[PDB]
Amino acid sequence: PVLNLNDPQAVERYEEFMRQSPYGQVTQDLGWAKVMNNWEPVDVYLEDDQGAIIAAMSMLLGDTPTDKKFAYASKGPVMDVTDVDLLDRLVDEAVKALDGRAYVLRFDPEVAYSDEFNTTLQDHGYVTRNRNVADAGMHATIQPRLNMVLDLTKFPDAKTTLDLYPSKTKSKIKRPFRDGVEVHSGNSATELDEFFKTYTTMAERHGITHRPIEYFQRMQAAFDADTMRIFVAEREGKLLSTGIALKYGRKIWYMYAGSMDGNTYYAPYAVQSEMIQWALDTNTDLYDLGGIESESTDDSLYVFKHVFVKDAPREYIGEIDKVLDPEVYAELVKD
Ligand SMILES: [Mg+2]
């Protein structure tokens, strides 16, 4: 069925399923629609014979150069997507709710790529975008398919971040702290401003645009201090670097960062160490450091993130598209 966002009780059940699901994703939580307040929310779900929710999908509709909308369920749906018969059922509900207004329904779940899975999806009528598309550009995928994920369940005895790494890396992580760097965290307006100052500075230094502060304020208003947390690194009164991490489902996700120009005393390493500590203290299964463009020392994102994740980067299935309007799809989507 389709979720009535005006029914507190219905909404409560939807959230309770999302928050308790091992497949939960913050970008599938109802709070995400509040962050993306410029998009239109349309959410659906399936129930079992007991009337209990077994699958859900939070979609957001965006405008395009055409009379059709772009329906996107970021990192959804919430369920075991390899169970394609169930997926088809959930999708059919989504399709019904979209009511012909969208030219496509796209979802990019965090499930490993495999020829077997890719083939099944294609056999079921879906159009997939992964190893067959451009690694970048407006034709690339919305979310990076390659991601540096730290699997903490491999270290059941880990008490502190250092316990996860070899001596050489322990050295790199100890450096900033040994040099006076200190990190405090929370989710207050004060910490958001601190983040914003480093965020805009880093953006200017990199010649890129930055999201407005209101974006993060909506995020702060949507998620409590146990879900969203900002880490601020400083040295003797000098703001150095920051990072924003979200804890949801089976992982804590390093989503945004900022760092001042000049000498930063490896403050970014300190931020990472504290985010990882938060994962450990909360018994979280995974710490996700985000995407990379390529697994090579030529990728600076890979270089930084490889310090904390020595395992191979995870490669997801990519974008799964349920083509609704063929003509428009071919116009707006190409390899
Ligand atoms: Mg623990």
Side-chain angles (χ1 to χ4, degrees):
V2 56
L3 173 61
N4 182 2
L5 294 303
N6 296 137
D7 180 337
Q9 177 167 178
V11 168
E12 231 305 83
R13 181 176 67 168
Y14 189 90
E15 276 294 299
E16 288 190 39
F17 166 76
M18 294 298 225
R19 294 203 289 267
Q20 301 186 63
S21 176
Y23 301 114
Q25 292 286 342
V26 72
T27 52
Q28 280 297 287
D29 184 273
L30 293 183
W32 195 246
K34 300 179 179 302
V35 174
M36 307 307 278
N37 67 332
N38 46 136
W39 294 61
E40 190 188 339
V42 177
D43 313 304
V44 297
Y45 62 90
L46 296 176
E47 289 167 342
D48 56 23
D49 281 303
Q50 287 42 295
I53 292 180
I54 67 179
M57 177 181 279
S58 299
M59 306 175 276
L60 289 178
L61 285 53
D63 291 309
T64 68
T66 71
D67 67 331
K68 292 297 175 67
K69 296 274 190 181
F70 171 66
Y72 177 55
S74 190
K75 294 186 178 300
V78 179
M79 60 169 277
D80 182 357
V81 299
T82 67
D83 180 349
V84 189
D85 284 343
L86 184 52
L87 175 68
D88 289 349
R89 287 184 54 205
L90 180 60
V91 171
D92 289 329
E93 279 300 283
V95 177
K96 180 170 183 175
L98 293 179
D99 196 42
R101 297 196 300 157
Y103 78 90
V104 68
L105 166 53
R106 167 175 299 170
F107 42 103
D108 43 11
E110 301 204 309
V111 175
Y113 168 84
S114 78
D115 303 318
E116 169 285 305
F117 190 24
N118 193 52
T119 300
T120 296
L121 290 166
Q122 299 184 326
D123 284 326
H124 279 248
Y126 301 100
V127 165
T128 67
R129 311 183 79 259
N130 41 228
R131 293 181 173 184
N132 59 310
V133 301
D135 294 21
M138 32 63 259
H139 282 155
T141 55
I142 298 177
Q143 301 289 310
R145 291 194 312 111
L146 294 178
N147 302 77
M148 303 295 279
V149 180
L150 178 57
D151 189 346
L152 300 175
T153 67
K154 292 181 183 180
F155 305 83
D157 278 48
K159 289 291 81 181
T160 69
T161 305
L162 287 156
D163 297 322
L164 304 170
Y165 304 96
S167 297
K168 179 194 181 180
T169 303
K170 299 186 194 296
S171 292
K172 300 177 175 182
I173 298 170
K174 276 180 179 299
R175 186 150 41 177
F177 299 92
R178 155 148 30 76
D179 287 337
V181 181
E182 267 170 44
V183 185
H184 63 282
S185 68
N187 202 199
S188 64
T190 287
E191 303 171 311
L192 172 54
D193 283 339
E194 297 182 313
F195 160 76
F196 202 65
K197 182 174 193 178
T198 64
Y199 175 68
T200 55
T201 298
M202 164 286 295
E204 190 175 312
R205 185 176 66 252
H206 294 50
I208 59 175
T209 310
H210 64 279
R211 293 171 177 281
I213 194 173
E214 285 76 36
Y215 172 86
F216 302 97
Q217 295 181 307
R218 292 197 291 284
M219 200 177 303
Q220 276 210 143
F223 306 106
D224 61 61
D226 287 312
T227 296
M228 175 181 179
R229 186 164 308 173
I230 306 171
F231 295 66
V232 178
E234 298 180 357
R235 174 179 185 292
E236 314 191 80
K238 276 274 284 294
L239 180 60
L240 305 173
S241 77
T242 71
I244 298 180
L246 275 296
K247 170 176 181 302
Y248 203 92
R250 289 176 54 239
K251 76 177 183 181
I252 287 192
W253 177 14
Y254 165 55
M255 293 178 61
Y256 301 89
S259 56
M260 300 302 255
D261 299 339
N263 297 302
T264 48
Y265 300 76
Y266 287 92
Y269 285 176
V271 173
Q272 288 305 302
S273 181
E274 287 296 302
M275 288 189 163
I276 292 175
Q277 190 62 53
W278 182 31
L280 293 172
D281 298 328
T282 60
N283 298 308
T284 304
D285 285 358
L286 316 166
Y287 178 58
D288 184 14
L289 284 86
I292 52 172
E293 280 211 63
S294 170
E295 171 175 40
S296 71
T297 64
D298 289 298
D299 189 326
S300 59
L301 281 178
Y302 169 80
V303 173
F304 175 72
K305 298 179 189 182
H306 186 60
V307 172
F308 302 89
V309 174
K310 305 291 163 43
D311 285 337
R314 297 192 167 192
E315 189 194 327
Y316 300 148
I317 185 62
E319 303 178 320
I320 303 173
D321 293 336
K322 177 74 177 191
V323 189
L324 301 177
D325 187 316
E327 196 178 341
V328 174
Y329 185 75
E331 289 173 1
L332 304 176
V333 185
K334 301 163 195 284
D335 327 298

